[PDB]
Design a protein around this ligand. Sequence first.
Ligand SMILES: Cc1cn([C@H]2C[C@H](O)[C@@H](COP(=O)(O)OP(=O)(O)O[C@@H]3C[C@@H](O)[C@H](O)[C@@H](C)C3)O2)c(=O)[nH]c1=O
Ligand SMILES: Cc1cn([C@H]2C[C@H](O)[C@@H](COP(=O)(O)OP(=O)(O)O[C@@H]3C[C@@H](O)[C@H](O)[C@@H](C)C3)O2)c(=O)[nH]c1=O
Lengths: 370, 379
Amino acid sequence: MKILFVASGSPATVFALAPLATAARNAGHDVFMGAVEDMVPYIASAGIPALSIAPSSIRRYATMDREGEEELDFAGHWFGRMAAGSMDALREVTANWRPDLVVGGSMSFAAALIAAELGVPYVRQAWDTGDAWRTDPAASDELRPELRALGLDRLPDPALFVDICPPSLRPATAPPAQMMRWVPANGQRRLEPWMYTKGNRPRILVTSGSRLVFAKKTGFLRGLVADMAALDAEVVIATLDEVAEELRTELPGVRAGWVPLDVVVPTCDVVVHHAGGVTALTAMNAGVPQLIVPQGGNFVEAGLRISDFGAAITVDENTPEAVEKACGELIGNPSYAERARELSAEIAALPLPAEVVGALEGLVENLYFQ
Amino acid sequence: MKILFVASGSPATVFALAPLATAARNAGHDVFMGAVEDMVPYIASAGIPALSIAPSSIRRYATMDREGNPVRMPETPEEELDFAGHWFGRMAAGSMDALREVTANWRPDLVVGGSMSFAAALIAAELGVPYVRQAWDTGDAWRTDPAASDELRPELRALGLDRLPDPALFVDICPPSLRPATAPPAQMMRWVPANGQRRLEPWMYTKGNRPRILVTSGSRLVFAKKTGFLRGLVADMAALDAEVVIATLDEVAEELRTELPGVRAGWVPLDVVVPTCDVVVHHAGGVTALTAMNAGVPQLIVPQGGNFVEAGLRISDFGAAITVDENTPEAVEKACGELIGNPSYAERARELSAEIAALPLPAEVVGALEGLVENLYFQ
Ligand SMILES: Cc1cn([C@H]2C[C@H](O)[C@@H](COP(=O)(O)OP(=O)(O)O[C@@H]3C[C@@H](O)[C@H](O)[C@@H](C)C3)O2)c(=O)[nH]c1=O
Ligand SMILES: Cc1cn([C@H]2C[C@H](O)[C@@H](COP(=O)(O)OP(=O)(O)O[C@@H]3C[C@@H](O)[C@H](O)[C@@H](C)C3)O2)c(=O)[nH]c1=O
């Protein structure tokens, strides 16, 4: 069958959907994936046919409205405006290539709208362990004109929710879902021996994710690397190649640039990040403790669940003393790695993406979730 | 578990292994794939961790032997088999130094190799781990094993072996109607396309009112640079009321665009465009042949040597293709008219598509790979 995947404005949203999209292609289905114009090379390099569904300028809707608790409301309205700006290209593509099913990420609201316009089932796939649905009332408010055309009062419930959240981190209030084993599918490069080999010292990976807006604030990574000086540890910076250069001149002896996280994370004692959900999943999957230094965003609450479970530490304040002490604890106290391995085991026990493709087939053949 | 995939010197060898490698990654395994240095961007753009296992200069082994002496170009099918076994055998020998360096730091539990990725057989034996051979097309690549075993006698002698060892498992993608009767026993697999991707444009997935003919010479730079092959074939289709599209490397396309007014030329993901085509015209490329058969599209094979000619003749004998005997414009235009006009060719191609579809999925084959490693205690 024809399956349309709808990703968003950041590389992690492509990476989060690539296992289910490649699992569907491997089952013989015709799969296309769409995203913002500058995310198209990430889709193509994940080995998926790539569609541009919005110009890169649509990120202006993060600081502007359609006329020209707060974090939840803001994200719902931002992703809503991004969904609204993606409809023209999605309608043009689907008039020529009509999908039998549409799969969208957590906040890829245009997937919900195009599926309803086509009269085909809509599948929502969680792109992290955060509550995929917390931003829906704000998104429904933003998309009231598109929803009104379909005679809808709010975003419609998906025909199926595919969740990757392990049971120990899943809230009591979480909607029913087809569970799935999350697997990494991040951007790849030519591997160098340091990426898959470790030395005698513990290895600390520091990252601020794959969004250019976050990665450009190099002071965040520079400060975190400086905080680890007292530790006898090797520090590796995983960041965009476009911003790495500036970091290389400022920090001699520290590797900085794109390193496939799935390759290097199993060599790390600690993963230090900005509260990025897909980086959090990569660490949990490899049984690696993590240090979360929240820089706002909508994953902070879900990151606190990982900390409460004991597979991480969320620092109360970004101070050098708090960062170095937490890193020492994550390396030194074996309970953190023990809890991370328990989360890895929970993820491993969930249905494989190949098995979830069977649920999608059954859904389209009107056998399942009827 | 850790699984090492070993591809070869052309992008099609990467594409042929990408479904099983991605299916193993999707099952939670740690998967690395290695190839010659200039094939590394194709592995990385298939979304797989990429290793360079040989310098691009290793391709000198197609024209020189290990003693540095010139190698005669094959002139017969028997000579083509011998030549390919020795050429791939030499490339395997030249890949061992880097494979030994990588596997000393990252020890795979299993090694998967393509049809003639003989270094996969050698590194698996050196590591004492199971070796899986995956067919990269419907051709009988095992027929080059005696010539490859002769070439690799020094590496085999070190392991106390008299010939290349039998794989622990052979994974074959050849549909039953095209599979020869003593093919070795195999775990069958449904082949799926995994070719290099690009930003899609509407012409790629939409068709016009005229039949669409796709012409290609594959993904090897050495063969793609001979643009006269594609130019001649496009000129042969002038009398047909048809849209002609050239699928070729971006690096060689401009020449074809200036020489052929109104004809699109460049990299187009074959899996996307082939379902819009009435005919696929090619040089006897096995992965292009599988892409056409999978989509139920008739094909015109214009053999240019190589080890797929005999397998291409089986597709022609089945009736899902025409192999031209004489490469004249008259033969090419007549065969194209027949492939478009006679519906029997497309119905045979659809029968081959149905046979491929009935085979075990790559996700199911990953289970067979796990079973080889999991049952090691019981031999
Ligand atoms: C810089 C860098 C990144 N990556 C990958 C790892 C991961 O797959 C992704 C980074 O995602 P992350 O969770 O760090 O955050 P972000 O890039 O900001 O993604 C946003 C925010 C997340 O909280 C949410 O889960 C994403 C879907 C979108 O990019 C690599 O593999 N190597 C690298 O060097
Ligand atoms: C030029 C071009 C190529 N491709 C893909 C299609 C196919 O996956 C591959 C081309 O492979 P093909 O079977 O045409 O032949 P070749 O590139 O010469 O590969 C050699 C010879 C084959 O007979 C053998 O099956 C391969 C494993 C190696 O590249 C595309 O998707 N789009 C393109 O525009």
